[model samples]
Target: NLQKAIDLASKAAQEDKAGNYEEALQLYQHAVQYFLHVVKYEAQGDKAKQSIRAKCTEYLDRAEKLKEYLKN
Candidate 1:
């Protein structure tokens, strides 16, 4: 379902472009979940995990930042 997650993330970004921050955040989260699973499954050293973790954290951070902007 990696592709599914990516699609969800793509949808989230599209929704965000439409000014749907909440919906976008949800989709981003779903994407992160799949990314995390991939990270967990890849036993070829934790590179996948680390990479996904970084991305997940980055997106989460962006979402939080967006929340602050929403307060306006």
Candidate 2:
């Protein structure tokens, strides 16, 4: 949950660029949400939380992009 988000998000992104919006949406959102999950409870120290949290916005952006594209 905590550490796993990194692999899942990055891998999902590679999957995303090849044009798997549907699958990307699923993994993307999951990974980002999982990252947020990590920040919330799993991480220790404000530094770790802030660092991990920083990436969430970007992932969420990618997630929502796929979602919007898929929804249309």
Candidate 3:
């Protein structure tokens, strides 16, 4: 399931590159949820959870930016 997030992130990047901001934003959002669930469940050790949190932050930031761009 973690690997799924990575794949989603990659797909999000592709959509972003193609100027499909809405699709990219949705994909990024989905990836963020996966990380959040892992962190919430303590699916891994503290180190891994911390790593996932970092990824979630990164994706969340990108998704927010996408949302703003879409609003324009």
Candidate 4:
């Protein structure tokens, strides 16, 4: 789960860097959900649970901003 989130987030970062906002948004959202699964299911007692959650919020907010920009 963590690995999947990592992979998607990395790809999304690249896409965002490349100016592919829609692609990046989708991947960011997918990564966020995977991260949510991680936090909700597998992250109990893990030291980096909060860290993972922080990144999740980052990705989700980033996507939100991008989506608004796209629609504008």
Best by lDDT: 4
lDDT of 2 by residue, 1-72 (tens): 865787788778888898776776777777877888866766777888888777888888878776786788
Off by over 4 Å in 3: none
lDDT of 4 by residue, 23-68 (tens): 9999999998888897888785667887887898899889999999
lDDT of 1 at 39: 67
List the candidate numbers ranked by lDDT, top first.
4, 3, 2, 1
lDDT of 4: 0.89
Query: Candidate 3 versus the native: TM-score?
Result: 0.83
Candidate 3 least-lDDT 10 residues: 34-43
Off by over 4 Å in 2: none
Judge candidate 1 at residue 22 and give its lDDT.
Answer: 84
Poorest 10 consecutive residues by lDDT, candidate 2:
36-45
Candidate 3 lDDT, 11-52, residue by residue in tens: 998998888889899999998887787778656787888788
What's the residue-level lDDT of 35 in candidate 4?
85
Poorest 10 consecutive residues by lDDT, candidate 4: 38-47
TM-score of each: 0.67, 0.82, 0.83, 0.88
Candidate 2, position 27, lDDT: 78
By TM-score, highest first, what's the ranking?
4, 3, 2, 1
